[PDB]
Design a protein around this ligand. Sequence first.
Ligand code: CA
Ligand code: CA
Ligand code: CA
Ligand code: CA
Lengths: 331, 335, 339, 334
Amino acid sequence: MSIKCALDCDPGHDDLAMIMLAVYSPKLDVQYISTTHGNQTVNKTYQNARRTLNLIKRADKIPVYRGYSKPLTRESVACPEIHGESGLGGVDWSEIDRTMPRNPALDILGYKDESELRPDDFFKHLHRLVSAAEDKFDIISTGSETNIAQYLLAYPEDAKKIRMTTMAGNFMIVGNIMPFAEFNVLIDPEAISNILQSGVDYTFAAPLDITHTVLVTEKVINDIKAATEPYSPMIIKLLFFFKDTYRDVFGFIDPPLHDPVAAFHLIAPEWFEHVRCHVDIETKGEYTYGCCCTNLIVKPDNATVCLKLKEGGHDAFWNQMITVWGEIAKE
Amino acid sequence: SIKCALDCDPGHDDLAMIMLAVYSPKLDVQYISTTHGNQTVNKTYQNARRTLNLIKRADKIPVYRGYSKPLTRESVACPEIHGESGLGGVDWSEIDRTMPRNPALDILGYKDESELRPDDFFKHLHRLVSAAEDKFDIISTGSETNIAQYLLAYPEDAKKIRMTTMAGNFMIVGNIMPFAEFNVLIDPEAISNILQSGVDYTFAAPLDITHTVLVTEKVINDIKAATEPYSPKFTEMIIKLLFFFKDTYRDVFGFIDPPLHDPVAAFHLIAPEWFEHVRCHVDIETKGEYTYGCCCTNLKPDNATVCLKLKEGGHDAFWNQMITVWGEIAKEIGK
Amino acid sequence: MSIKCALDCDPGHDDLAMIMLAVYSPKLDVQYISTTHGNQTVNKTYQNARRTLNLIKRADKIPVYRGYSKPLTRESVACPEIHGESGLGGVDWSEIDRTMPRNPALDILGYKDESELRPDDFFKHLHRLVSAAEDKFDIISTGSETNIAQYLLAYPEDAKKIRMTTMAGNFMIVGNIMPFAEFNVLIDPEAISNILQSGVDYTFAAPLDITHTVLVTEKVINDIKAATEPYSPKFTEMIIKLLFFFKDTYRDVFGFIDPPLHDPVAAFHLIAPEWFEHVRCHVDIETKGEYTYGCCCTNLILKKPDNATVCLKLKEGGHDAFWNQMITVWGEIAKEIGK
Amino acid sequence: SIKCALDCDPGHDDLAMIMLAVYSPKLDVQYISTTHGNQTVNKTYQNARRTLNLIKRADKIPVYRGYSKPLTRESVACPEIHGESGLGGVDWSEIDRTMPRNPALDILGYKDESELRPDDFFKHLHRLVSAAEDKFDIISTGSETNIAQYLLAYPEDAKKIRMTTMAGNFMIVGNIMPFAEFNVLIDPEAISNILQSGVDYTFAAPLDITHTVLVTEKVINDIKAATEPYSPKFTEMIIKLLFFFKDTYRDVFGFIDPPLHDPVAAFHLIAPEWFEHVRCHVDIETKGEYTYGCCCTNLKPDNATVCLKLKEGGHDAFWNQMITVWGEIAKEIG
Ligand SMILES: [Ca+2]
Ligand SMILES: [Ca+2]
Ligand SMILES: [Ca+2]
Ligand SMILES: [Ca+2]
């Protein structure tokens, strides 16, 4: 029993880790990747998704769609201070690029080349998956949720058959890029607000509440080397670029690894605390847009929030993650 | 002859506008996309097709069914002007039963209408925009959700699009809300996106103009004069449609004679010489609790043309154009 | 029966006309004038109120208070493009200033001099009037409504005993200084919003809907001369130059041929309400809009509890009744000023 | 000795703060103004007077009754932390019966309390502000409506006022709303006006600090040690007051030991050396639907000082100061 899903993301060094976990995890069957604006322009995140796939020798298997370039009703805002100009700083990609297979999505779409990629391309693919699902189709979202909101404006009747597992928000701690809000929400608050009203089964699987406790320590670096060096002398430099920037910008000693925890939730939900509640997304605030405001501490519930991993959860997460990195090294 | 597309929410005004645009020799209608507004987008789709079939063009013009709701707000129907169907006042059962297949299904390679999707029109419009020598012309007389959706998908096309709209109020107050007009206030974010996109945008027919363009009794008799001799049934249909539209406008707004809004937009593309025009910066209120959709002007760089008035002669030129088309349709429908 | 009232205003050429009508009307008994920010700084509108009174030989009778210098939660915004730098352009005030009596308000307050004037001075005065009223005490407001809002934050229990007659807003036509809103509301929308929630009996007596139809035409000019020239040629010169300064600016900025005279219509409503159409309704004041703050939004195009009366039109006859009242007062002032 | 005024909404914390400020030798309290918040301003007035009478000062310190509602919003009481009276946990009937006349009535020339008006304190404060060598010190631990009202009346006095406040949350989340603290969110426009006015404004005691300042068991025993030998009844009263405050904080927010918020503000004026401090630009959310009153910082010109933490030693210094005052009050009550 393996779970069909799609990934929506903005790679992004976290997003790269998340793609590795999701694609190589036996529990998941990734149907496609759609990229979004966020960290970088959606053209760069598209490229970075493909690079990730090619590195792990899957760029010829998984279709990658290039989604929307800006939020519904706001201006784009890149995050180059964590991720670099390319969106995946710290490595030379020139080889990975030159040896890059054709994107399977072009075949699904019947396109000659990438210049024909359009933001809504993924719609028909996802609609087939949603139709085929016995209960609900699973999306893992770890960037802005513009793409999914765009989709549900086009296919509103599909909302009730979609389950979203997201890295988004902050509830019991403060924000990152703004005082009380998290990057993914605040770049398109209207998107998430639309989704939470749509009838989607929505889980905040990995808010900052969890992910700020999931740090790439030196012990984690040595366990990666232990699992990968014997098979394949990139991943380290990538997590180190991500380390230098998080120290530079936020004064974290060890950087949090956000997005994979979302994928981990779909793989292994038993390791997560969960509560149902009503989440309001601030869209009107001048300085607080994207705040995730909850009734927990009487509007109906519209979401599940995971505030903490059960003890054991951190180790379960790293075990899962080191294993996948091991398998990729073998290949 | 000017290639264009129509975006609309029929709607009795929108029906009049489709007739003018399709039969005007100056225009070449490439497609019709329908939007939410007056009614659900499924009803406005149906009503667009009905209009086309009545005027014997439902087999020529492709009709797309666009988005069912605004970008970030709830839908709000206008059944108190237009009825439950969106085109009250007539029995459509014949026009429906004798309805040709929609040419859009052929372009799209679809078996049937149940496969129509809101973004279907995108690729069609992109080809038109690419082919245009200067800019491609869209006439918009409903919510501008569809065009905003399009420009989120094809942002680089904005600079090659020219929009001619029935929207807004500038120097007079609103209709459905105190200071705002229906088409803007149902999706203010849409129009706001458009005005920021680089589109060449013209407020061709705000309430400022259209409230002076009334279906009087004189207008009704000139319609009969131009149509009865060729097609009594068409006369019956068009008159009952404008009368339903009359009763409701009296009921809801206390107008003696109802304004005919949407055709004026098409008239602008046909015959711009009859319109006053000024360039300015338009801000759309999106934050106001009671004033969202207000068109606020500096009368900040210019982002729009506003037409505040017809030149003297303009009203007669408009009605002549409109009566002529109704005459031509009567000839085709026959006796 | 003569009606006790207070004036709140920002003179301002209209406000000057309104003070003349109110002070000399036999139907009204003006207890005080409080000035507010708006047209000019509140210190200038204070001065201009006093000047008006001194011109009409009443600066020693009517106390003038100097109210709040800025809105509750927004920045001040002067209107010098209609009114000039002084707030009362078009005449030389240097004589009227030199011969200026002590302000009776200083006596009520027990103040040595004007340097002690404070925005909330008028509060205790108004509270006594409100307490003494049999039904409600009448305020005529023709500037920002900051002062009254400030008062009701201090004396909230007095709201139910206050009746306000205002020159404010636009309902069935568009605005002046912003597309859909009128100056007096948009300079302090929160103030009016507080008032409409407070329990005050509030009347929009003179929106732009009415006042844009109340123009200083040539016929009006000749009737002023007829009523004033025989008694006081200089007063004729002064009042005309004042309405002419107001004419040049309104033509310059808004392309009016003949300028509207706004604020006196509010006072006229208290004098003679029979000349006004009136309807009760719910008015929402836009406070959140970026470009539309101060809009007066109602149900009134179409066919929440009522919180206001709106006067959309004068009854036919109303314009002439207004000018008769106004020219009579200008006549009486001419008699008193003399040659 | 530092001349100051207290603005507050007692409130159990506010009561503790009044005790510290009035009995601290470093401070000279000129007056107390009460505000809406925890309870109606009439109740917080009463509670301020009660506090003063308990500590035998109700005949010395004038108490003004300020504004009953925010500038542009509806009042919102906090009876779930503080009770119906605003000072639950004890019987005040004796303290009330034996209550001296309010010195403010004498300053104002008023027959009785029914004549108290929200703006009464204005002229008093203006004299203090004028007399100050540099700036006059206000300690604010409720809504800041009164001070905002004052600065609308006396805008030129802003540059001569220094405010030390218990307000806000910066690096942690809020209490009564997800990302905002009670005192700010009940009148965000007030604080926003103040930060634009030219006031020297210090967030001396945000939740960042006060959530680390808990009434533990050790603190309870030090209170008994300092007070029981002089005044058993005062011991009973102060303990029941902190216990009422304990039960409610556990009930509502699941705190083991309740934070004591407002005195930390007064402590800052007494002893600023124990506080970390940084200058920054604070924006107050006024437009947000669910986030009004958020203190958003650039951590635009600086408009405030923020104290994010006590220096190590600071907690003990605070409690020493606080236990000492409670000791001295016990001596006087007997
Ligand atoms: Ca990401
Ligand atoms: Ca329409
Ligand atoms: Ca005025
Ligand atoms: Ca307090």
